[PDB]
Each structure stands twice: as structure tokens, then as C-alpha cells.
Design a protein around this ligand. Structure first.
Ligand SMILES: Cc1cc2nc3c(=O)[nH]c(=O)nc-3n(C[C@H](O)[C@H](O)[C@H](O)COP(=O)(O)OP(=O)(O)OC[C@H]3O[C@@H](n4cnc5c(N)ncnc54)[C@H](O)[C@@H]3O)c2cc1C
Length: 389
């Protein structure tokens, strides 16, 4: 197989991970790779191809004016407009400037065409940055703003809408525990753009609503593929590890705990392992709670320190639980520990990154530049891994 060009894989199980008391959602999904050439390793990513929501496809058909019963060859052999808009057109992301140039070329209203060309010009870079990018206006909202821009079928797919990208997920299973299934842990995305558009995450919604073979024969399926990563466990189990990913950052570590549990059903000494997990509330989004405690019953995990974002008077996060445990994690580093970080890259990672910078000082007696350059060397050594998005 080839990673980029997918394998028609089937969804076997699809389950909600949060309690009904929770007001968010996170899905546990398993792809069935039996009878396929797909192989994966612990810590790898699975790329998933999806399709647009039907209402989004409808709005595009309204704006474009094509006959959805038109067959054409997208540079499936021939495909209808509706299915090309569903599976191959990114409709909700913001149009690039070259896409605006193409819209203007077909805008029959002088004022609208002038405004489109302006938005793509250097003189318009400031208005483009605010009205398109900062407001997260979709291509569909731009086209409604300029209803005279009617590009032909070929131009639209070649220059106006880019391809619907696959969404990547850090596999949450180990091949030793399930070489027939690729597990994913996918949080539902549902936000409101600054300009007020209700956006449903394209892939996370398709995963949340997918029909599993465990509940019906007429079950969902997706073209999937595996991407090799460097988010890997050390060579031998004696090496201690530190895992920090909260929320969906738990994903790869579930395979991490499955991999080492499988090996040491027949392997070697456990070696210290500590999992820093965080979530909103033990009654809401403590995903995989039972499975986590089972890993602690056996020798997989050794200590699971928890941070609760909205359970109690003190709002805690994984980095707050790290500074309290700053004494033992330093000991772990001198014992040669690998440190893993997975999950949100904008805040959690930045805060976790700048909290072990500050505890390698107090517990290391280095100043800033010496603590900074030291942490950098842990990365170059390959002992400080980050799988963030
Ligand atoms: C290596 C890797 C591993 C990952 N692992 C996981 C995992 O284990 N679990 C998991 O849940 N996720 C994971 N992700 C993230 C995941 O790939 C998706 O990004 C996420 O699920 C949302 O996909 P979606 O299709 O639902 O979102 P999209 O529909 O792509 O939405 C993406 C975001 O863009 C915003 N947006 C909407 N409109 C616009 C616009 N016009 N311009 C700009 N932004 C806009 C949306 O509000 C939304 O927040 C991973 C990502 C990477 C790179």
C-alpha cells in the first residue's frame, strides 16, 4: 500500500466516550484492517478521508448553479457534481488569493469583480487578513458575498476549491493487542466563527455519526492510510517514560499502554511509567477510565496523576500537577527517562513546555539559558517528543 493513496477500510465499532452528563463528545472508533495490507505501529498516525455535510454540499450547489447530475472527470473515473463537492472540494476553509483571482475572472458584476481583485491584491492584504482569514469566512460565504462570481465546473475544482484534505489521528491501539483494528480517539469539533457561522468539524462529525459494523451490515467506511511517526517507545522496557497528554492527547498513550502490557505478558521488568492526564470532570470526560485503572492493576502503568479542569474549587491542569511532582520527574530524567507530550499545541503544550523549563531550574540549579539549552538537548537526543496539533 501507499500512505497517501488510501485503502477502503471499514468502521467496526463506534462509541461515545463521554458520559451523558457531559456537554461535549468524544468518539472511540475502530477501523477494520483485516484482509488489507495496512500495517501500523504504536504511536503512528492514521489519515482519514471524509466528506462534507449534505447541507454544506447543498449550499455550494445553490451558489454554483451546476446540474448535480453532471458527470465529469476530476483531474472515481467520472463523478457527479454532488459527489465531487462532497468528497473532493474543501468548501468551508477560507479561499486563498489565487482562488479569489479566479472568482473575479468570472464575476459579471463590475463592482463585485473589482472587490474580489482588490482582496487578492497587495493593496487589499489588510482587508483580506481581517475579512477572510481572521473571520474564518468559508469559500461558500465569500461566494454568497459575490453572487455574480459563477466559475465553470472545471475552473472551480482546478482553482477555486482545493482538495478536501484527509484528517490525521494518532492511533490509540497497539498491534500486539489488536493487529486487526486501528483505534482512533476523536473529539467532536463544533465552533462558531468570529463572523457567526456555525461550523461542524468535517471529519469529527463524520466519525461521531459513522455506522459501525457491530450495529448493522449497511455500515460506514472510509479511505484510510497509516503515516509512520517518530512518536515511539524506547528500545527496552527498563527505560522510564513520562506521558503528559490530556484530553485527546491520551490517544497515543493508550497504544503505549497496550504495547507494553502486551510485551510484559511475556517480557521484562516494568520500568517506571507515569501518565499525566487531564480533563474537565471525572463524571463528564474522564475517557477510558476503566481501561486506565486496569493498566494500573497490572504492570503497564505505574502512576496516574490526574488534573481536573472543572471538578472542585481549584482548576487544575497537567502542568500544575507537574510542578507539584517536579521532584520525582527530575529524578526520572537522570535515570534516562523519555518524556512524551501529546494533545493541544497552542496552550497545553506551550504551558507544559514552559513548566518543565522552570522545574529543571529549581530542581536543577541552572538559570534560564542553561535550562533552555538543556531541554533543547533532550529534544536532539530524542528523549523529549511532542505529538501536538
Ligand atoms: C498528528 C495529528 C494527530 C491528531 N490526533 C488527533 C486525535 O487523536 N484526536 C483528535 O480528535 N484529533 C486529532 N487531530 C486533529 C484532527 O486531525 C482534526 O484536525 C480535528 O479532528 C478536526 O477535524 P475536523 O474535520 O473535524 O475539523 P475541521 O472541519 O477541519 O475544522 C478545523 C478547525 O478550523 C476551524 N475553521 C472553520 N472554518 C474555518 C475557516 N474558514 N478558516 C480557518 N479555520 C476554520 C474550525 O472551527 C475548526 O476548529 C490530530 C491532528 C494531527 C495533525
Amino acid at each position: 500500500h501507499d500512505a497517501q493513496h488510501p485503502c477502503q477500510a471499514n468502521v467496526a465499532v463506534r462509541r461515545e466516550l463521554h458520559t451523558p452528563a457531559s456537554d461535549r463528545s468524544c468518539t472511540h472508533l475502530e477501523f477494520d484492517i483485516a484482509g488489507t495490507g495496512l500495517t501500523y505501529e504504536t504511536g503512528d498516525h492514521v489519515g482519514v478521508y471524509t466528506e462534507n455535510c449534505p447541507e454544506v454540499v447543498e449550499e455550494a450547489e445553490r451558489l454554483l448553479g451546476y446540474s448535480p447530475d453532471t458527470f465529469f472527470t476530476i483531474h472515481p473515473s467520472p463523478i457527479t457534481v454532488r459527489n465531487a463537492l462532497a468528497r473532493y472540494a474543501d468548501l468551508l476553509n477560507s479561499p486563498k488569493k489565487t482562488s479569489l483571482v479566479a472568482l473575479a475572472t468570472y464575476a459579471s458584476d463590475p463592482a463585485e469583480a473589482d472587490r474580489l481583485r482588490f482582496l487578492a491584491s497587495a493593496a487589499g492584504k489588510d482587508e483580506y487578513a481581517q475579512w477572510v482569514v481572521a473571520s474564518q469566512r468559508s469559500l461558500l460565504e465569500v461566494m454568497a458575498e459575490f453572487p455574480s462570481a459563477k466559475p465553470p465546473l472545471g475552473v472551480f475544482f482546478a482553482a477555486v476549491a482545493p482538495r478536501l484534505q484527509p484528517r490525521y489521528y494518532s492511533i490509540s491501539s497497539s498491534p500486539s493487542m489488536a493487529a486487526t483494528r486501528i483505534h482512533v480517539t476523536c473529539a467532536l469539533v463544533h465552533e462558531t466563527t468570529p463572523a457567526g457561522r456555525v461550523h461542524k468539524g468535517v471529519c469529527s462529525t463524520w466519525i461521531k455519526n459513522a455506522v459501525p459494523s457491530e450495529e448493522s451490515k449497511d455500515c460506514s467506511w472510509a479511505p484510510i492510510f497509516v503515516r509512520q511517526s517518530n512518536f515511539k517507545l524506547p528500545a527496552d522496557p527498563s527505560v522510564p517514560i513520562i506521558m503528559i497528554g490530556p484530553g485527546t492527547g491520551l490517544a497515543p498513550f493508550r497504544g503505549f499502554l497496550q504495547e507494553r502490557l502486551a510485551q510484559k505478558e511475556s517480557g521484562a521488568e516494568l520500568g517506571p511509567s507515569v501518565f499525566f492526564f487531564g480533563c474537565r470532570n471525572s463524571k463528564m470526560d474522564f475517557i477510558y477510565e476503566d481501561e486506565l485503572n486496569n493498566f494500573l492493576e497490572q504492570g503497564a502503568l505505574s502512576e496516574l496523576v490526574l488534573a481536573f479542569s472543572r471538578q472542585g474549587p481549584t482548576k487544575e491542569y497537567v502542568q500544575h500537577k507537574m510542578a507539584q511532582k517536579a521532584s520525582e520527574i527530575w529524578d526520572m530524567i537522570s535515570q534516562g527517562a523519555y518524556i512524551y507530550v501529546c494533545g493541544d499545541a497552542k496552550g497545553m503544550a506551550r504551558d507544559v513546555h514552559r513548566v518543565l523549563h522552570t522545574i529543571v531550574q529549581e530542581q536543577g540549579s541552572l538559570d534560564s539559558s542553561k535550562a533552555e539549552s538543556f531541554v533543547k538537548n533532550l529534544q536532539m537526543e530524542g528523549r523529549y517528543l511532542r505529538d501536538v496539533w
